[PDB]
Amino acid sequence: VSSVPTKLEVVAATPTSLLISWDARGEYVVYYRITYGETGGNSPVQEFTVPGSSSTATISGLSPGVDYTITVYARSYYWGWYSPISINYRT
Amino acid sequence: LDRFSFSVFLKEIRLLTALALPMLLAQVAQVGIGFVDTVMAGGAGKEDLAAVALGSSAFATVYITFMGIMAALNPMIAQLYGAGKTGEAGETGRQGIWFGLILGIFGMILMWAAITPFRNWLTLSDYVEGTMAQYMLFTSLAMPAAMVHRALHAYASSLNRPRLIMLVSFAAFVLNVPLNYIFVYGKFGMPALGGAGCGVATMAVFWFSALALWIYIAKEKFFRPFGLTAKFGKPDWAVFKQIWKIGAPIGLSYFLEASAFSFIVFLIAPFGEDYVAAQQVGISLSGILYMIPQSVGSAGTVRIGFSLGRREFSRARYISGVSLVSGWVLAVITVLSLVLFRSPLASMYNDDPAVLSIASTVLLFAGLFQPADFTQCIASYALRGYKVTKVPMFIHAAAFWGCGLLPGYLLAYRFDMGIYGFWTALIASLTIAAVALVWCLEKYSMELVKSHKAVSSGL
Numbered sequence: 044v045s046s047v048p049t050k051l052e053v054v055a056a057t058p059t060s061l062l063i064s065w066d067a068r069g070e071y072v073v074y075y076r077i078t079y080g081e082t083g084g085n086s087p088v089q090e091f092t093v094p095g096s097s098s099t100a101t102i103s104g105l106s107p108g109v110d111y112t113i114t115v116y117a118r119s120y121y122w123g124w125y126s127p128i129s130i131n132y133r134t
Numbered sequence: 135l136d137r138f139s140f141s142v143f144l145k146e147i148r149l150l151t152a153l154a155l156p157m158l159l160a161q162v163a164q165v166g167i168g169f170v171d172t173v174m175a176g177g178a179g180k181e182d183l184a185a186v187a188l189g190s191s192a193f194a195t196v197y198i199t200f201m202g203i204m205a206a207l208n209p210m211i212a213q214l215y216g217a218g219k220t221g222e223a224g225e226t227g228r229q230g231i232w233f234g235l236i237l238g239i240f241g242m243i244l245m246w247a248a249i250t251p252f253r254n255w256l257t258l259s260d261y262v263e264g265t266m267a268q269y270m271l272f273t274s275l276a277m278p279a280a281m282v283h284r285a286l287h288a289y290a291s292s293l294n295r296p297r298l299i300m301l302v303s304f305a306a307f308v309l310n311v312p313l314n315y316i317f318v319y320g321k322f323g324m325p326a327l328g329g330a331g332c333g334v335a336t337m338a339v340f341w342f343s344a345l346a347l348w349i350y351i352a353k354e355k356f357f358r359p360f361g362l363t364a365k366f367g368k369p370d371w372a373v374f375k376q377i378w379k380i381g382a383p384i385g386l387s388y389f390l391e392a393s394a395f396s397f398i399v400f401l402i403a404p405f406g407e408d409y410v411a412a413q414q415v416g417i418s419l420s421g422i423l424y425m426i427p428q429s430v431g432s433a434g435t436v437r438i439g440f441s442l443g444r445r446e447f448s449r450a451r452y453i454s455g456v457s458l459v460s461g462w463v464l465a466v467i468t469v470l471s472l473v474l475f476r477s478p479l480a481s482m483y484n485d486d487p488a489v490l491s492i493a494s495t496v497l498l499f500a501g502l503f504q505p506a507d508f509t510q511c512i513a514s515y516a517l518r519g520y521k522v523t524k525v526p527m528f529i530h531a532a533a534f535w536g537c538g539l540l541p542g543y544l545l546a547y548r549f550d551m552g553i554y555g556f557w558t559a560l561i562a563s564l565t566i567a568a569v570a571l572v573w574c575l576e577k578y579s580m581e582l583v584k585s586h587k588a589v590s591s592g593l
């Protein structure tokens with residue numbers, strides 16, 4: 044009965060891959076799934092996954108300049124998901 | 135090609151409340167040290183061949199030069215008061231206090247070598263020597279330059295709500311005055327060597343304020359990780375080699391007014407002699423209260439690089455505006471009492487004994503370069519100060535001396551009363567500061583658009 048991991052930011056990349064450093068005020072029960080896609084709607088989704096107050100990580104960002112959109116995921120109390128939040132800002 | 139310092143003005147919403155006000159107490163402790171200074175100029179006047187500045191103000195060459203490098207941590211430790219461990223932030227602090235004691239022993243060493251103003255080419259005020267008890271202000275007061283980098287690495291760790299220095303560097307000066315004279319001739323004290331022993335006095339107090347770092351692992355949680363300040367990591371361990379490309383660009387860019395140092399003292403020695411060596415009760419009164427101005431931002435450099443840690447990109451570099459233009463309020467609204475007033479009977483014979491009976495051809499640049507610059511490096515205690523951007527901000531300054539080289543022999547060549555004359559493209563050298571800098575400060579607050587890569591969040 045809540046909302047998301049409620050910050051956003053991707054400051055820079057390493058214009059191949061990318062640092063994604065967002066909110067995690069503690070955890071909850073604890074867990075983050077992070078989505079992994081362009082916004083093409085083609086090239087399938089993929090999965091990063093992290094622990095503690097750590098949504099504050101960095102992708103393996105394979106492909107070049109192409110628009111990339113990417114969500115993090117709370118997981119709590121209920122082994123379900125508190126909410127998600129996403130931004131799309133690519134290379 | 136009409137504007138290329140992009141969206142200039144904007145650095146504004148309702149920021150009337152950018153309160154960098156304990157960031158003046160970063161440089162009101164610095165009038166506190168600024169003013170030991172004269173109390174042994176007009177304190178070692180007990181000796182009259184103790185004009186003494188003759189070494190003490192040519193010691194403070196490799197002070198304020200290596201000084202730069204050190205006060206170049208102001209980013210680091212403010213910027214990692216955007217992370218958490220003041221002991222990793224501090225294992226710098228330590229690794230720099232290793233610098234500030236390592237480079238500190240080069241002041242301490244390049245000073246040894248130093249002592250050979252046994253040399254000549256042009257007039258007195260730079261050659262003539264007979265009895266030099268400067269001999270020993272060279273040592274008794276250059277054997278300190280080690281504990282004096284630490285004694286500064288101090289406020290290079292006052293980058294996070296301490297003005298615990300304004301505290302000390304006053305109950306510091308006051309300790310010296312007493313002390314100071316004891317050595318010029320004193321009590322039970324080592325009472326003889328006097329014109330260098332104002333220097334063993336001064337330098338004595340460096341080591342005292344050197345341990346006003348120690349006694350301020352005191353009022354809350356630590357900045358003490360003084361384990362073996364040791365290094366080795368790659369070829370040579372950084373967090374130290376990192377300090378490097380913040381250091382370099384700075385002292386070497388403090389070697390701006392390090393040649394506006396041998397600009398200022400190479401136009402008293404033509405037939406300039408008399409009133410052209412009063413362009414120095416003038417430009418002495420530049421530094422004097424230019425310092426609390428100027429260094430509002432060399433204290434604002436916190437509030438900016440600090441608040442990029444706490445990732446408020448330009449919720450900082452757009453106070454790097456209303457901090458820029460706020461002492462910039464009296465940057466002009468007290469550049470007024472600089473072209474206006476004089477060295478009247480409000481000047482006696484102090485910091486440079488030359489007052490009653492000389493021309494006011496000296497306030498004619500206490501406006502020229504004066505506000506047109508006032509801020510024009512508090513633009514850098516905000517570029518470096520914010521960013522790496524002393525990188526070649528270094529080459530901000532390769533200009534203000536190579537943009538003002540020719541306005542060197544352009545007082546000497548003049549059209550009128552060209553006493554503020556070689557203050558030509560050395561107030562245009564020095565107002566192509568109004569550009570290049572605050573240029574990468576709209577390259578550069580326009581940076582934290584590229585950087586603030588997720589504009590905001592939800593609820």
Ligand SMILES: c1ccc([P+](c2ccccc2)(c2ccccc2)c2ccccc2)cc1
Nearest residue numbers: 171187191192395414417418419421485486
């Ligand atoms: C080189 C040597 C001495 C000084 P100054 C001085 C500074 C600024 C403007 C004019 C003069 C000095 C300033 C502040 C503290 C100590 C010394 C200086 C020069 C001649 C005689 C006394 C002091 C400056 C450059």
